[PDB]
Amino acid sequence: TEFLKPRLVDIEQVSSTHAKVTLEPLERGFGHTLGNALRRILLSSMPGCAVTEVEIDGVLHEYSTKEGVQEDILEILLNLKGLAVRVQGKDEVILTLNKSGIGPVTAADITHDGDVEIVKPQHVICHLTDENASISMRIKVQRGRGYVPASTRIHSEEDERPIGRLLVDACYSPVERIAYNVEAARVEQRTDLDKLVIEMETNGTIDPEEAIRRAATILAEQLEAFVDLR
Amino acid sequence: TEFLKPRLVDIEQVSSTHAKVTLEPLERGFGHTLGNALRRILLSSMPGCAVTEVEIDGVLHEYSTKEGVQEDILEILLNLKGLAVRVQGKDEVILTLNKSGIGPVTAADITHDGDVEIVKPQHVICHLTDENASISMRIKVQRGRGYVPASTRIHSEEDERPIGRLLVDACYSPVERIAYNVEAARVEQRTDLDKLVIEMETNGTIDPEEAIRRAATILAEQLEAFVDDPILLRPVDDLELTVRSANCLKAEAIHYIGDLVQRTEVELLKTPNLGKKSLTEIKDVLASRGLSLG
Amino acid sequence: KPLVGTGMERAVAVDSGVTAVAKRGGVVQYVDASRIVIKVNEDEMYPGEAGIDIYNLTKYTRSNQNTCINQMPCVSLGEPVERGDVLADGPSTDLGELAL
Amino acid sequence: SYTEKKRIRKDFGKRPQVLDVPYLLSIQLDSFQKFIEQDPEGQYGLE
Amino acid sequence: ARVTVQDAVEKIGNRFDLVLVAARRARQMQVGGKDPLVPEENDKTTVIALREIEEGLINNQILDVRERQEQQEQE
Amino acid sequence: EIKELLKLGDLPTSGQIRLYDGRTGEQFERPVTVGYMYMLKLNHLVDDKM
Amino acid sequence: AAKKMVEREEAVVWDILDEVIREHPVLLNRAPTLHRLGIQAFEPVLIEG
Amino acid sequence: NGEPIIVPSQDVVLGLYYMTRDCVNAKGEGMVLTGPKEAERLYRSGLAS
């Protein structure tokens, strides 16, 4: 009847993607329970932003080649699917990208708006191998969770798109790998209190304390239906 | 980005100590999360009072034998472990048991105190084979959380262990058995959502739904630290006007549809060089823009 | 590519004709999604020509089993090549190794 | 080599190769060569 | 008998005429619209007929005397 | 030589690591052989068989 | 109208299909039927896939 | 024959064999249990093997 509450004490931010959040203290056996519940919730359902539609000019479908560029439109779409981004204010932003000359067009050349920050700026999208070449696209960034493939998005929409609106599979989840280790915390009168360190590898577009806050909120709002009725 | 909450559809009372809850629908991969969390909490850290120690007189240790009783002292420790007490006052109550004669001793013959009570008075402790034989034991209960066995209890207990004492396991948590399983459910189209079917079978001193509610209360209390004229003011030259009708409407000195809305049908035909074709050219585009005039 | 292989993969991938091997070595003048333009060395160049080879990559051609055939260029701009190296990975080859 | 300097496969074979693997389509190309080719006396194919 | 019909076989004696009498009762419920003597529980007429057989409300001669008394009360 | 390369890569020599359960969070009682096979996707697809 | 309703796969059509499938056995067979237990009746569950 | 055909095959069999094997000093041997529900509780909590 005398349980103690855990406290989010430190976030050892190792790199822009890595993290190490330790919760302390926990009673005997609560470490594995809270660690596995938070690991399942954080790996499954965390909201983030991803690319949904791209519209390149002069390109009618993904299975086509552009002159001047080096990679196909399928390769450009997979490279844009790999792009991580952070949208602050709104729910859906549309980005543009115009670049000419010879050289790898990166994610730094995407013209930012106010409430959108590109986290990994050196991320390469395409390669230009002509002096008179140019590409101009309209990248659309949505926000959801989980994994919504483009075929089931065509299943789950209503209108017809114009020809030249390439759809991308959506992987909104920012979290890639989460492990937890339960050591024994050192509280001077208790030889049973554990600490739970959640090493977590994002893709940069989320904060670790924010993620564990959202995960504990999801777990509490799911346990509401148990704690209320029977 | 809001979630899906379950609708409880079943509390199937098998008996007064065995229910079968069923929650559906839950999000995909949440049935195992909630079920394993509640199962680990109920097995390991649900507090409740149980027998931890018995001092039976005339018996040295577990490999001796008292007479007049058809059960060995291993069976006596087992039957005493199976008893279901509920202490309301204190954290430590030492009971006594005294009964002589031919016949079995039940839990109704236990010398009760005012605080504790026995939910199974018919729970048999022993049987007696001799009329002159008697039973004389002190039974110590405590308050604790979850199962903790007498093997590690006596491995940790290295003091002067007096004669007559006998370690027994602690069935502190009131649940005798919980085993969920996760089915597959289906909101109106999709079937990746799941249905969680808890099959809880406690002992007495609690209801199953009460223990499930207290387990969820334990988990929520443990988690609650980090828990929380729009188109009229637009220009007119992008409304598919031809190169003749453009200089027709610029003779009307009009740049916005906000400068067309006040233009009455008398003005539309008394202003110069707006013929019938230009009248149709402005009329069909105001019709396709939905606005009316006059 | 397989992390565990045999070394027969490069032989199968070149000898199948499904890649684009370099007829005469030199340096790469211009890469595209559908063209490779190689400036030949003057030693391999013949005394009556210019020394420019064009490779037209076949893109998204259908195979007999309705699968995809396209040649993805595996060289970069200004990279020097020799006679007998892979310029374009075929359908299921990776840098000139068989990758099924 | 140039396409081999970019990724070299670690070889675990302990015996040398005194004969490389030949051109794997010599059978078809050589048979149709002997059919279609102009020979004077060693009579092959169309002649 | 939504799982197994061995109890209805134990009631009648022979699975083949069990199938025939259950078919006749299911036709009387599906075409004729006669009342299911067992509660429905939102079931198909074949499983309602097998439930009636396993309960032991109808048989072959019970169905024959039922349709005979319907023929007597009409004609 | 396989074990020598495994010792270079700071991995277990016997080839087997200790895996944890994905759902319950518990641990499989024996070490499980974990590695990197090369899988192929054959042309007998349920889109064509169904 | 019924053809367009079944062809468009409305949610009411899926509810009707779950009502129809219910207590309607299907036969499952795998060639070669070497003996009689290579045809067996099962009750179907409607699964995505 | 008269033998059953609904027989467990290799994974049910490996699991039931591994469940009903025996060790000599596994974990918490020599305890005395009130029954199968207590044995299930012991193994699931992890106080025994």
Side-chain angles (χ1 to χ4, degrees):
Chain A
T1 71
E2 304 95 21
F3 305 105
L4 302 188
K5 314 294 151 288
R7 292 301 141 178
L8 195 132
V9 280
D10 66 319
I11 315 144
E12 185 184 333
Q13 179 107 19
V14 176
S15 155
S16 90
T17 88
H18 210 59
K20 268 197 174 182
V21 187
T22 79
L23 315 176
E24 163 176 5
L26 295 173
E27 314 281 347
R28 177 179 298 273
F30 269 90
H32 294 270
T33 294
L34 296 193
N36 189 42
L38 286 186
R39 185 189 168 268
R40 287 184 59 84
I41 288 167
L42 283 161
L43 254 161
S44 95
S45 45
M46 293 307 296
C49 291
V51 176
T52 299
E53 320 175 349
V54 191
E55 295 191 29
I56 323 178
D57 63 323
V59 168
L60 297 134
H61 45 88
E62 321 150 320
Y63 325 97
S64 149
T65 86
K66 202 178 187 174
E67 55 157 343
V69 316
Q70 185 164 326
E71 294 120 22
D72 316 46
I73 304 303
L74 221 31
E75 183 103 25
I76 292 170
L77 281 195
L78 297 170
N79 279 346
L80 285 171
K81 192 201 165 220
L83 171 66
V85 85
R86 169 184 295 130
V87 178
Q88 286 283 344
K90 38 197 61 162
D91 252 2
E92 163 164 336
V93 68
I94 284 185
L95 324 168
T96 80
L97 167 63
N98 316 321
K99 167 69 152 38
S100 321
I102 279 183
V105 39
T106 83
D109 286 336
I110 299 181
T111 117
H112 68 283
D113 313 350
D115 39 18
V116 49
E117 174 208 0
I118 289 173
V119 273
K120 183 198 170 192
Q122 76 263 355
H123 182 89
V124 44
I125 289 166
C126 162
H127 267 60
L128 278 177
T129 49
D130 194 317
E131 198 38 69
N132 309 27
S134 174
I135 180 178
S136 77
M137 30 175 49
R138 273 166 296 274
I139 310 174
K140 168 188 288 191
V141 169
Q142 265 193 9
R143 163 194 305 266
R145 74 184 181 272
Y147 158 70
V148 177
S151 90
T152 74
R153 199 177 312 125
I154 301 179
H155 191 187
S156 208
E157 64 196 350
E158 33 89 30
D159 207 287
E160 192 77 36
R161 302 175 274 104
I163 291 170
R165 186 171 275 170
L166 318 165
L167 281 179
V168 184
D169 274 0
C171 272
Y172 309 109
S173 198
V175 187
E176 302 203 4
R177 164 181 71 86
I178 287 204
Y180 59 93
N181 319 100
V182 182
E183 298 134 332
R186 299 320 303 126
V187 171
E188 75 276 351
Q189 83 283 349
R190 291 287 277 274
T191 80
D192 83 305
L193 293 196
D194 302 357
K195 58 174 305 187
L196 163 87
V197 39
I198 306 179
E199 157 190 318
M200 151 184 200
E201 182 170 308
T202 91
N203 63 336
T205 180
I206 213 184
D207 229 20
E209 183 177 339
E210 200 171 14
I212 298 192
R213 197 69 54 100
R214 287 186 205 274
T217 311
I218 287 165
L219 192 45
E221 282 198 346
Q222 284 289 335
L223 290 151
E224 287 321 292
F226 278 89
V227 79
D228 279 15
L229 172 87
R230 304 310 170 275
Chain B
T1 326
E2 81 269 9
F3 267 82
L4 192 51
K5 314 300 187 54
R7 310 278 92 191
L8 213 160
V9 297
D10 194 2
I11 308 111
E12 187 263 329
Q13 287 289 141
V14 163
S15 87
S16 155
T17 189
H18 181 198
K20 189 220 289 184
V21 202
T22 291
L23 287 97
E24 39 158 337
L26 308 135
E27 282 275 349
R28 185 207 60 182
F30 267 51
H32 290 273
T33 298
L34 309 179
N36 203 66
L38 292 157
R39 193 193 42 81
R40 274 190 58 87
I41 272 183
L42 284 159
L43 282 203
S44 283
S45 314
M46 174 63 96
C49 320
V51 176
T52 166
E53 182 64 32
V54 46
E55 268 89 14
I56 165 67
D57 311 300
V59 188
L60 173 49
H61 75 138
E62 192 32 62
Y63 292 123
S64 30
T65 289
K66 209 199 171 181
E67 277 70 31
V69 48
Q70 82 185 12
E71 301 96 331
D72 55 27
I73 46 180
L74 216 41
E75 283 163 295
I76 311 173
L77 303 198
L78 209 151
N79 285 258
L80 274 193
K81 163 152 56 187
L83 187 51
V85 288
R86 33 196 317 185
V87 183
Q88 301 182 10
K90 295 183 297 308
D91 301 326
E92 167 55 74
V93 166
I94 297 179
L95 307 103
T96 35
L97 181 64
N98 283 316
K99 158 73 184 308
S100 171
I102 299 281
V105 48
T106 173
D109 318 342
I110 296 184
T111 62
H112 85 308
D113 304 11
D115 39 6
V116 318
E117 69 265 39
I118 309 300
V119 287
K120 276 194 169 304
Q122 78 283 345
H123 177 60
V124 278
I125 279 85
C126 304
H127 283 52
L128 304 179
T129 79
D130 167 49
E131 179 63 40
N132 323 340
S134 88
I135 182 68
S136 51
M137 46 174 44
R138 276 91 38 87
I139 295 161
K140 166 192 290 185
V141 314
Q142 276 209 32
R143 183 183 314 276
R145 308 195 300 247
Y147 201 102
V148 39
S151 94
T152 179
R153 194 55 195 96
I154 199 54
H155 286 52
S156 43
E157 199 63 80
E158 294 308 315
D159 65 359
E160 174 39 70
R161 277 110 73 164
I163 202 158
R165 85 171 284 172
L166 279 179
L167 258 296
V168 83
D169 294 343
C171 281
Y172 281 151
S173 67
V175 40
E176 281 189 358
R177 160 160 226 272
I178 169 186
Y180 79 109
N181 89 302
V182 174
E183 304 282 327
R186 171 179 53 90
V187 86
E188 84 305 307
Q189 201 37 68
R190 50 189 184 274
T191 160
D192 41 315
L193 313 174
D194 45 351
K195 159 173 78 168
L196 153 77
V197 189
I198 305 183
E199 190 128 27
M200 189 182 203
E201 185 152 357
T202 162
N203 74 81
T205 74
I206 212 69
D207 234 7
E209 324 106 330
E210 190 57 43
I212 279 174
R213 273 174 310 199
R214 203 183 320 277
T217 323
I218 282 180
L219 196 43
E221 176 203 321
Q222 254 287 326
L223 254 203
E224 73 108 7
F226 28 72
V227 158
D228 311 343
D229 289 338
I231 199 57
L232 292 85
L233 275 295
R234 215 249 295 135
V236 289
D237 292 328
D238 53 53
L239 313 171
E240 67 254 59
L241 284 303
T242 180
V243 309
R244 181 195 58 86
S245 81
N247 54 85
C248 300
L249 79 106
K250 284 311 305 181
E252 220 175 2
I254 290 183
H255 59 284
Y256 288 162
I257 308 98
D259 306 288
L260 289 153
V261 55
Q262 82 276 5
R263 303 305 183 97
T264 305
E265 54 191 11
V266 289
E267 192 262 2
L268 314 180
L269 317 175
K270 283 313 304 182
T271 41
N273 78 307
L274 316 187
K276 192 62 222 75
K277 179 45 62 183
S278 37
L279 176 52
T280 44
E281 175 46 39
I282 63 151
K283 260 193 165 197
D284 77 321
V285 68
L286 62 90
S288 51
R289 284 310 167 185
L291 172 143
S292 306
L293 211 37
Chain C
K1 45 110 215 318
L3 310 162
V4 195
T6 317
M8 200 73 41
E9 289 100 10
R10 198 170 309 271
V12 171
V14 157
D15 290 323
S16 35
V18 94
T19 45
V21 86
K23 315 161 194 163
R24 291 181 312 194
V27 87
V28 171
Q29 195 189 358
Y30 164 64
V31 204
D32 205 328
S34 60
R35 261 173 44 157
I36 303 183
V37 179
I38 293 206
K39 197 165 209 319
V40 197
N41 298 331
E42 80 280 347
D43 320 50
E44 323 175 22
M45 197 189 303
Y46 297 147
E49 67 190 36
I52 292 296
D53 302 9
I54 313 294
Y55 297 89
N56 290 341
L57 309 185
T58 89
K59 306 293 287 191
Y60 298 99
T61 301
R62 188 180 54 98
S63 65
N64 287 356
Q65 276 68 29
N66 282 3
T67 55
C68 197
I69 293 180
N70 66 329
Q71 296 185 340
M72 272 196 160
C74 82
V75 304
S76 51
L77 202 63
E79 168 161 334
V81 304
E82 285 301 311
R83 170 186 128 274
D85 309 279
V86 180
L87 306 169
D89 306 327
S92 76
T93 95
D94 165 80
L95 290 214
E97 292 203 63
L98 199 67
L100 316 169
Chain D
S1 32
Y2 269 143
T3 176
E4 210 180 323
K5 280 185 75 66
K6 292 200 291 185
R7 180 178 68 213
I8 326 175
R9 193 169 281 266
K10 160 155 208 47
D11 223 294
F12 266 139
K14 295 124 190 62
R15 276 156 186 89
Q17 25 194 346
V18 312
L19 167 74
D20 45 351
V21 168
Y23 181 65
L24 281 186
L25 315 163
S26 86
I27 182 186
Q28 298 267 300
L29 279 161
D30 278 12
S31 315
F32 201 74
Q33 191 98 328
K34 292 183 167 197
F35 165 73
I36 213 181
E37 205 28 76
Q38 288 235 21
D39 67 85
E41 64 86 20
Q43 284 310 307
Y44 270 130
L46 286 184
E47 186 82 8
Chain E
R2 52 160 325 268
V3 186
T4 165
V5 294
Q6 196 80 289
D7 33 350
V9 176
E10 275 155 15
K11 287 295 292 191
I12 296 192
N14 196 293
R15 312 180 153 259
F16 300 136
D17 27 321
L18 155 80
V19 173
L20 285 178
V21 65
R24 264 195 166 85
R25 181 59 196 186
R27 283 235 174 79
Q28 275 149 325
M29 293 198 238
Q30 176 167 135
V31 198
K34 295 197 176 67
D35 222 333
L37 314 109
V38 167
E40 172 191 12
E41 217 257 333
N42 201 296
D43 291 344
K44 278 236 180 182
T45 44
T46 71
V47 202
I48 299 182
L50 269 178
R51 200 140 104 245
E52 289 177 358
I53 285 176
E54 188 273 344
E55 212 287 335
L57 300 161
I58 69 143
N59 283 87
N60 181 227
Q61 68 286 334
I62 299 285
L63 262 176
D64 283 304
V65 67
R66 271 186 91 258
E67 64 98 11
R68 265 187 306 263
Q69 86 186 358
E70 297 304 85
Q71 285 263 60
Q72 263 102 54
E73 65 87 12
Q74 181 69 330
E75 297 91 330
Chain F
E1 297 166 304
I2 287 181
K3 285 171 181 186
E4 212 169 302
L5 219 55
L6 273 178
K7 274 175 192 164
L8 168 71
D10 265 359
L11 301 193
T13 309
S14 97
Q16 294 175 310
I17 61 179
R18 216 160 67 184
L19 291 187
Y20 293 85
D21 208 335
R23 318 169 305 164
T24 80
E26 266 143 346
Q27 173 186 267
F28 301 129
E29 315 190 351
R30 315 187 72 173
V32 189
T33 295
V34 182
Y36 274 77
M37 212 183 307
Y38 191 66
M39 306 302 285
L40 326 169
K41 183 195 174 182
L42 321 170
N43 211 335
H44 307 273
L45 313 177
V46 80
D47 292 271
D48 318 342
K49 313 258 163 286
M50 193 258 257
Chain G
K3 274 177 72 69
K4 198 61 70 61
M5 278 193 59
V6 179
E7 210 272 340
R8 274 317 205 174
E9 309 174 18
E10 315 255 303
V12 54
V13 168
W14 297 113
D15 190 15
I16 286 179
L17 181 66
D18 306 355
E19 188 176 75
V20 161
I21 277 280
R22 191 170 160 65
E23 295 151 343
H24 199 126
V26 303
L27 293 177
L28 268 190
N29 161 46
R30 191 199 82 90
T33 316
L34 290 166
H35 66 336
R36 81 179 196 177
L37 315 143
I39 302 180
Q40 266 162 297
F42 296 98
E43 290 198 325
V45 186
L46 303 185
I47 50 142
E48 54 176 50
Chain H
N1 33 50
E3 297 211 16
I5 36 175
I6 309 295
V7 63
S9 195
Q10 98 207 18
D11 204 356
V12 199
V13 189
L14 182 56
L16 288 193
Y17 181 84
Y18 187 79
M19 198 193 310
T20 73
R21 268 297 286 272
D22 66 319
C23 202
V24 282
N25 198 12
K27 188 149 150 35
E29 76 156 357
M31 300 168 76
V32 179
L33 312 178
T34 71
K37 323 170 65 177
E38 200 198 359
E40 174 194 69
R41 181 159 83 259
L42 277 207
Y43 170 64
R44 282 265 154 81
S45 47
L47 298 176
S49 170

